[PDB]
């Protein structure tokens, strides 16, 4: 009947969906690889999509996924093991590195530019009419490490003008250079700024941008990615 | 067996539980002492759930059902066959369920990002065990429970709901209700709004959060923003959760009578208690 | 403790955003509103502007009127009284003309018309906004995804109150305009076709009701927990992979074995959303239509 038809006709719709849903999530990271680099054999039943293009805004070019993938930065590990499936030791510092959880892609080396096509972040004093509205202001305090030592003070929120939204705060080291922090990585107190992620002789480490005006987006991962890093690597250093 | 982009990410370290023994993958897949918790909790269960369907004597999916044991039994340990099999099945889910999220803080730690998976995820868990532990204890017999089988289970919710009249009038039901569909209404927006911005129309630019932004303030006059529907969707979804325990839990514990009546405490405040006409005067 | 992000712990506020231009019409949007710091905590704080516009002050006018329309019966049924409104509101009920009048519209005020009148204004309302979502798409040049998953919801209503109404051949199977009635005629309309949990569609759509909550917890949480490299930046993490796209399908993979990019997480959404009422609207339909109990469907499939 009608109603065994229609339901019979759903399942079969719903596995075709299913097949495209998941060819779709195969834009990036595939093909898959082996721990060396060289095409893994085995890529599952589902073929690569057919690549799409993407018109980047603001003259930025175009983006034709899926395509040729590639670090585009060295990566400092090793083989722990003779077989496939275990762990790849670090043979440096991970952190200066920038493997494991402290990893960072090679993203453009510009800033991510709002609909206007000027700069989407900004450090506020630079952000005519931007204001803090509510909450603590951080601007002044200082910022204290997971290791309970004062590592800087906050001399300015980057904010988001599009989304009026802090995105990092900058601190002020003990020789005078500045570093973004993430927003999202530090606790603001009534009279401090605590991060436990970073103990306070870590926080020189933190790459720097090129520009004191701007970020790009390069530079917001291997910053991100540092901090974030620390969280397993400073791990020694941090007492509570 | 690795993404184009995973190596520099398949560091050692972030195991809970026992060093370096069970840090390692299999295909995609990551172990971890709490991969192997996991595994062995889950054969168990299922060999128990087969071993049931033996003693039930079919092999067909839609008929098989392991039931937990009658009231007579209260709170006590029952036969296999009368009940205990349920139970470690039960007990053993459990120990399937929490393992899986303990892995979770495990591949959160080993990648450096937070912990609000492992953390939602945990909302379901205390649902289940809403409806297998908490309520029956309270109540007083495993036998409140619901068994394990694809229809069967779909009974109980049948029969235990018309218990208490028509259950829609469990006022937390009602709550727990308007999470989910608000939910649903919420990730069919958020989804369908990236979507358009990423696949404009044929030939024009990506278009931009700003464009995002604005084409909400256009449609209903505000836009909650990025990091904001965001946290809206965890939140109406732990909140569904969190209201459909708490309508269960009361259940049959605190109000055993028919929902619907419960209504009659607005309706009879004293000051228009008794006020003539409408629809109860 | 960390931070976990969930609320904002500085809020930092600008000139009002007036939004981008493209092709809209300038005239039609409104002025910028206050600024919700109550808001400001949990998202964006400001208010508006809004554009208005021919259909939304079209849709916003028959909203107004079937809203109205219920509530003068409502009052009507209250004896004027606001003491017995406020105590009975959620009993009140207008209720579709009797099943004697079939798909007439002559039937009285008091015994059904007052119910076509409110129905009426509200399909006018509802379609009419619906060509307001895809307009407001047109004009910014975006896809138009909204609009089309909108029309989804839009199906399980249309089938409710209008078509099955229809294919039955009277007013009086579609449903009531109150608070308890219409959780009534619910419970009553599964009683009737044999209990709906035999309704495979039924079925089908509670699974994605469970499955947008599942993935809306699993995607919101995972944004969340990669905000610390600007997840929630999805429209540029897909224009250029970070680190954040990357620990978000990782972390995924290595729980259960595949997993999702930036841009398909997001059609997986949309697509688990819109099964919701487009499976539903489909178990309604061919209920008492062409299947008039599903326990008995359920045993012979036909
Ligand atoms: C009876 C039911 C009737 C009830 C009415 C309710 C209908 C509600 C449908 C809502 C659909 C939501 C979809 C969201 C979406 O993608 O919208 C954007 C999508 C693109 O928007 P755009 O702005 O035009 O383009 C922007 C970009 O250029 C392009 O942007 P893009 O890349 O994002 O869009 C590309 C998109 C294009 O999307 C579509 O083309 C939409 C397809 C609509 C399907 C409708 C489902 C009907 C359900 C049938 C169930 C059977 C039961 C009987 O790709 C897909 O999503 C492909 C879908 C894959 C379907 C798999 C089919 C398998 C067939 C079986 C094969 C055998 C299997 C082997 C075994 O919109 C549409 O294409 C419109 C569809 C409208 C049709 C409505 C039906 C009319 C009646
Ligand atoms: C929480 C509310 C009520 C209840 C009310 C209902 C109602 C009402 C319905 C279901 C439906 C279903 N229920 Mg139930 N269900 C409950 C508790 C459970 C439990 C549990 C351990 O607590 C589980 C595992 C299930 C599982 C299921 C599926 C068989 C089915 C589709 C659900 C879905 O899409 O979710 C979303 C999740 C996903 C898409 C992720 C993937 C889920 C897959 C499908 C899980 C299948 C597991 C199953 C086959 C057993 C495996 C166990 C062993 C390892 C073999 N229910 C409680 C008692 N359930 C619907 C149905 O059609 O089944 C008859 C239905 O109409
Ligand atoms: C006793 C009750 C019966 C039963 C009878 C029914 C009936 C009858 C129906 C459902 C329906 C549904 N049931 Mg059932 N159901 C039962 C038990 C359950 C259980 C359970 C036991 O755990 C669950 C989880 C569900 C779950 C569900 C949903 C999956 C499904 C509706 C999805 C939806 O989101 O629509 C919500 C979305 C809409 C209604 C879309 C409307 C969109 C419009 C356009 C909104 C306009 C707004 C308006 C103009 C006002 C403006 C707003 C103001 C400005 C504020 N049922 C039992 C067996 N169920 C529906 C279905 O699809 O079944 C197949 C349905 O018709
Ligand atoms: C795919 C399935 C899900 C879905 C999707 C969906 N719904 C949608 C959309 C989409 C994709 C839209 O684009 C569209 C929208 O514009 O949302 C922002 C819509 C929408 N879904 C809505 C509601 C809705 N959707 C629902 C369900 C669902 N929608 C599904 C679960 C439900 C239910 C019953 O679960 C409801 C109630 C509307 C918010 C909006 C469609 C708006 C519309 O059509 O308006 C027409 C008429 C008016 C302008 C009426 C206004 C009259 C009011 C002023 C009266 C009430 C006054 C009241 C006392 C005010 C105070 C409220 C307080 C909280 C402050
Ligand atoms: C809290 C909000 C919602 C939510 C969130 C949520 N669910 C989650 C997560 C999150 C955030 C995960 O991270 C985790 C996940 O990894 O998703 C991919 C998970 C998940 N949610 C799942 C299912 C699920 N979630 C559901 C619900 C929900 N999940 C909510 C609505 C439902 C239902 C019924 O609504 C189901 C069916 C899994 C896909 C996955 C967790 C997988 C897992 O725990 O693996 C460990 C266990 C096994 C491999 C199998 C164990 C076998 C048992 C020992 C025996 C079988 C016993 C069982 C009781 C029989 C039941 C039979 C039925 C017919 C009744
Ligand atoms: C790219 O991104 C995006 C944006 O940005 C640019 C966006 O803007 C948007 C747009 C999104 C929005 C404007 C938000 C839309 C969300 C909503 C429709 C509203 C949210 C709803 C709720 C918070 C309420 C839901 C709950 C309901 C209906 C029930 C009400 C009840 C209670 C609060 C609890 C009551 C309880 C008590 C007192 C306890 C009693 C105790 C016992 C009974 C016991 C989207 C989609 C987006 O994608
Ligand atoms: C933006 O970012 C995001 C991503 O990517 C960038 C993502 O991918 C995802 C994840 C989401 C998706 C890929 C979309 C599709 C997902 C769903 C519809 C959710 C439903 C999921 C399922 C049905 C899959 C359930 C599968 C499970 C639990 C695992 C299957 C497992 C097995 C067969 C074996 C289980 C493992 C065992 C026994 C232990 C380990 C193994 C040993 C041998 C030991 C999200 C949310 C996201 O937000
Ligand atoms: C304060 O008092 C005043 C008077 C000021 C008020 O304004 C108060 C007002 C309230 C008390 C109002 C209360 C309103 C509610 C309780 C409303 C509740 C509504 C629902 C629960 C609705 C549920 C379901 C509705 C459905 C499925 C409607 C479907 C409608 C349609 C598909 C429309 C079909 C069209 C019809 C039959 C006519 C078509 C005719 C043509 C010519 C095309
Ligand atoms: C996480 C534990 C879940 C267990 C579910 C039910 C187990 C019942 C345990 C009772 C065993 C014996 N008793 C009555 C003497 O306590
Ligand atoms: C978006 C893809 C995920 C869809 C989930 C598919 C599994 C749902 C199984 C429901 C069982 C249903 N049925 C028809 C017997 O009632
Ligand atoms: C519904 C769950 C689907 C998970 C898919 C997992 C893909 C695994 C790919 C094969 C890897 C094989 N193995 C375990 C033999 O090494
Ligand atoms: C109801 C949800 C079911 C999810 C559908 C299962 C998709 C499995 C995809 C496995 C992909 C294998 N691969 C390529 C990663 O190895
Ligand atoms: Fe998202």
Redesign the interface.
Same mark, same amino acid.
């Given at each position: 009947?009608? !109603? $065994?038809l229609? @339901?019979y006709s759903?399942w079969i719709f719903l596995a075709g969906?299913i097949y495209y849903?998941?060819t779709?999530?195969?834009?990036? +990271?595939?093909?898959? =690889?082996?721990?060396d +680099?060289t095409p893994?054999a085995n890529q599952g039943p589902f073929p690569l999509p057919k690549p799409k293009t993407?018109?980047?805004?603001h003259g930025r070019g175009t983006?034709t996924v899926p395509g040729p993938?590639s670090?585009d930065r060295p990566?400092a &590990?090793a083989r722990?093991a003779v077989s496939?499936?275990?762990?790849?030791?670090?043979t440096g510092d991970?952190m200066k590195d920038?493997? +494991?959880?402290?990893?960072?892609?090679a993203?453009?080396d510009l800033p991510? &530019?709002? /609909?206007?096509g000027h700069n989407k972040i900004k450090p506020?004093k630079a952000?005519? /009419?931007?204001?803090? $509205?509510? +909450? *603590?202001?951080?601007i002044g305090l200082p910022v204290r490490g997971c290791d309970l030592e004062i590592a800087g003070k906050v001399v300015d @929120?980057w904010?988001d003008?599009? =989304?009026?939204?802090?995105?990092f705060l900058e601190v002020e080291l003990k020789d005078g250079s500045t570093r973004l922090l993430?927003?999202?990585? #530090? *606790? #603001?107190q009534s009279n401090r700024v605590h991060v436990?992620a970073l103990s306070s002789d870590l926080f020189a480490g933190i790459p720097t941008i090129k520009s004191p005006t701007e970020v790009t &987006?390069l530079e =917001?991962?291997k910053i991100? /990615?540092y901090? !974030?890093?620390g969280?397993?690597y400073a791990a020694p250093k941090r007492k509570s | 067996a690795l993404l184009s982009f995973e190596r520099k990410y398949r560091v050692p370290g972030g195991t809970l539980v026992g060093g370096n023994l069970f840090d390692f993958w299999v295909g995609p897949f990551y172990v971890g002492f709490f991969g192997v918790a996991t595994f062995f909790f889950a054969a168990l269960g299922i060999i128990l759930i087969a071993w049931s369907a033996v003693l039930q004597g079919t092999w067909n999916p839609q008929l098989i059902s392991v039931y937990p044991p009658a009231l007579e039994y209260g709170l006590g340990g029952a036969p296999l066959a009368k009940g205990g099999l349920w139970q470690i099945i039960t007990i053993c889910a459990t120990g399937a369920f929490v393992s899986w999220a303990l892995r979770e803080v495990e591949i959160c730690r080993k990648l450096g990002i937070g912990y609000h998976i492992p953390f939602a995820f945990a909302f379901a868990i205390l649902a289940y065990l809403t409806l297998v532990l908490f309520r029956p204890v309270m109540m007083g017999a495993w036998g409140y429970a619901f068994p394990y089988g694809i229809w069967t289970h779909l009974d109980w919710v049948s029969n235990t709901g018309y218990t208490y009249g028509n259950f829609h009038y469990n006022p937390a039901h009602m709550i727990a209700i308007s999470f989910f569909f608000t939910n649903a209404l919420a990730l069919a927006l958020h989804g369908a709004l990236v979507l358009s911005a990423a696949n404009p129309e044929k030939g024009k630019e990506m278009r931009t959060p700003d464009h995002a932004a604005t084409f909400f303030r256009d449609l209903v006059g505000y836009s909650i923003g990025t990091l904001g529907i965001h946290r809206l969707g965890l939140l109406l979804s732990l909140s569904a959760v969190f209201f459909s325990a708490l309508c269960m839990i009361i259940t049959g514990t605190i109000w055993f009578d028919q929902w619907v009546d419960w209504w009659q405490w607005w309706v009879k405040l004293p000051w228009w208690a008794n006020i003539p006409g409408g629809i109860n005067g | 403790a960390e931070y976990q992000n969930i609320f904002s712990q500085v809020q930092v506020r600008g000139p009002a955003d007036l939004g981008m231009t493209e092709d809209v019409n300038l005239a039609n949007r409104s002025g910028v509103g206050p600024f919700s710091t109550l808001l400001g905590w949990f998202g964006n704080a400001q208010l508006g502007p809004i554009y208005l516009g021919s259909l939304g002050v079209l849709s916003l006018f028959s909203g107004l009127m079937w809203f109205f329309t219920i509530g003068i019966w409502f009052w009507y049924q209250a004896g004027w009284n606001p003491a017995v409104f406020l105590r009975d509101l959620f009993f009140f009920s207008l209720e579709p003309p009797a099943p004697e009048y079939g798909l007439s519209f002559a039937a009285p005020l008091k015994e059904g018309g007052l119910w076509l009148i409110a129905s009426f204004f509200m399909f006018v309302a509802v379609w009419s906004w619906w060509g307001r979502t895809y307009l407001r798409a047109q004009a910014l040049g975006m896809g138009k995804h909204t609009a089309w998953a909108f029309l989804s919801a839009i199906w399980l209503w249309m089938v409710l109150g209008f078509i099955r109404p229809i294919l039955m051949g009277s007013w009086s199977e579609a449903v009531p305009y109150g608070i308890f009635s219409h959780l009534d005629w619910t419970n009553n309309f599964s009683l009737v076709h044999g209990n709906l949990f035999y309704n495979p569609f039924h079925g089908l759509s509670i699974a994605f009701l469970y499955g947008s909550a599942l993935l809306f917890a699993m995607h919101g949480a995972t944004i969340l927990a990669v905000s610390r490299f600007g997840g929630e930046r999805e429209l540029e993490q897909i224009a250029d992979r970070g680190t954040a796209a990357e620990r978000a399908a990782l972390f995924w993979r290595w729980t259960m074995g595949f997993n999702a990019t930036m841009e398909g997480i997001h059609r997986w959404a949309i697509w688990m959303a819109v099964l919701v009422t487009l499976t539903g609207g489909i178990g309604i339909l061919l209920s008492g239509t062409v299947v008039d109990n599903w326990y008995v469907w359920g045993q012979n499939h036909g």
């Amino acid at each position: 009947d009608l !109603a $065994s038809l229609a @339901i019979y006709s759903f399942w079969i719709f719903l596995a075709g969906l299913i097949y495209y849903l998941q060819t779709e999530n195969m834009r990036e +990271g595939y093909p898959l =690889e082996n721990e060396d +680099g060289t095409p893994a054999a085995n890529q599952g039943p589902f073929p690569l999509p057919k690549p799409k293009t993407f018109i980047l805004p603001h003259g930025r070019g175009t983006l034709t996924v899926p395509g040729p993938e590639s670090e585009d930065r060295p990566i400092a &590990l090793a083989r722990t093991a003779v077989s496939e499936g275990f762990p790849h030791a670090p043979t440096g510092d991970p952190m200066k590195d920038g493997v +494991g959880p402290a990893s960072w892609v090679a993203r453009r080396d510009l800033p991510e &530019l709002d /609909g206007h096509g000027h700069n989407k972040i900004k450090p506020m004093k630079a952000a005519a /009419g931007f204001h803090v $509205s509510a +909450g *603590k202001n951080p601007i002044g305090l200082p910022v204290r490490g997971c290791d309970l030592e004062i590592a800087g003070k906050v001399v300015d @929120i980057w904010v988001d003008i599009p =989304e009026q939204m802090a995105r990092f705060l900058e601190v002020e080291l003990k020789d005078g250079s500045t570093r973004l922090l993430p927003m999202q990585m #530090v *606790k #603001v107190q009534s009279n401090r700024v605590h991060v436990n992620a970073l103990s306070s002789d870590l926080f020189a480490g933190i790459p720097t941008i090129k520009s004191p005006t701007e970020v790009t &987006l390069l530079e =917001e991962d291997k910053i991100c /990615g540092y901090v !974030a890093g620390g969280l397993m690597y400073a791990a020694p250093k941090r007492k509570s | 067996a690795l993404l184009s982009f995973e190596r520099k990410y398949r560091v050692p370290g972030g195991t809970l539980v026992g060093g370096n023994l069970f840090d390692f993958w299999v295909g995609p897949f990551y172990v971890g002492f709490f991969g192997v918790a996991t595994f062995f909790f889950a054969a168990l269960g299922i060999i128990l759930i087969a071993w049931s369907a033996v003693l039930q004597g079919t092999w067909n999916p839609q008929l098989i059902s392991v039931y937990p044991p009658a009231l007579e039994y209260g709170l006590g340990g029952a036969p296999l066959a009368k009940g205990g099999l349920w139970q470690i099945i039960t007990i053993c889910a459990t120990g399937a369920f929490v393992s899986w999220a303990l892995r979770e803080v495990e591949i959160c730690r080993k990648l450096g990002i937070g912990y609000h998976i492992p953390f939602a995820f945990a909302f379901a868990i205390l649902a289940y065990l809403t409806l297998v532990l908490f309520r029956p204890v309270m109540m007083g017999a495993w036998g409140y429970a619901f068994p394990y089988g694809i229809w069967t289970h779909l009974d109980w919710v049948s029969n235990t709901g018309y218990t208490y009249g028509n259950f829609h009038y469990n006022p937390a039901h009602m709550i727990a209700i308007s999470f989910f569909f608000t939910n649903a209404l919420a990730l069919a927006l958020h989804g369908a709004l990236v979507l358009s911005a990423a696949n404009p129309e044929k030939g024009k630019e990506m278009r931009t959060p700003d464009h995002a932004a604005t084409f909400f303030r256009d449609l209903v006059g505000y836009s909650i923003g990025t990091l904001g529907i965001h946290r809206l969707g965890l939140l109406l979804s732990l909140s569904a959760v969190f209201f459909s325990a708490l309508c269960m839990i009361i259940t049959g514990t605190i109000w055993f009578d028919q929902w619907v009546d419960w209504w009659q405490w607005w309706v009879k405040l004293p000051w228009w208690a008794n006020i003539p006409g409408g629809i109860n005067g | 403790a960390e931070y976990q992000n969930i609320f904002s712990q500085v809020q930092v506020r600008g000139p009002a955003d007036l939004g981008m231009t493209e092709d809209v019409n300038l005239a039609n949007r409104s002025g910028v509103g206050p600024f919700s710091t109550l808001l400001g905590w949990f998202g964006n704080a400001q208010l508006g502007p809004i554009y208005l516009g021919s259909l939304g002050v079209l849709s916003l006018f028959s909203g107004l009127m079937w809203f109205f329309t219920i509530g003068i019966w409502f009052w009507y049924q209250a004896g004027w009284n606001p003491a017995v409104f406020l105590r009975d509101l959620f009993f009140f009920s207008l209720e579709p003309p009797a099943p004697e009048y079939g798909l007439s519209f002559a039937a009285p005020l008091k015994e059904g018309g007052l119910w076509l009148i409110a129905s009426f204004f509200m399909f006018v309302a509802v379609w009419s906004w619906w060509g307001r979502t895809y307009l407001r798409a047109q004009a910014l040049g975006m896809g138009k995804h909204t609009a089309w998953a909108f029309l989804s919801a839009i199906w399980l209503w249309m089938v409710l109150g209008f078509i099955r109404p229809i294919l039955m051949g009277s007013w009086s199977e579609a449903v009531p305009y109150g608070i308890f009635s219409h959780l009534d005629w619910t419970n009553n309309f599964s009683l009737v076709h044999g209990n709906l949990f035999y309704n495979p569609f039924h079925g089908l759509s509670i699974a994605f009701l469970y499955g947008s909550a599942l993935l809306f917890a699993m995607h919101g949480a995972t944004i969340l927990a990669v905000s610390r490299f600007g997840g929630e930046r999805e429209l540029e993490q897909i224009a250029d992979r970070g680190t954040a796209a990357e620990r978000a399908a990782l972390f995924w993979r290595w729980t259960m074995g595949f997993n999702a990019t930036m841009e398909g997480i997001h059609r997986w959404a949309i697509w688990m959303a819109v099964l919701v009422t487009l499976t539903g609207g489909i178990g309604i339909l061919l209920s008492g239509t062409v299947v008039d109990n599903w326990y008995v469907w359920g045993q012979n499939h036909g």
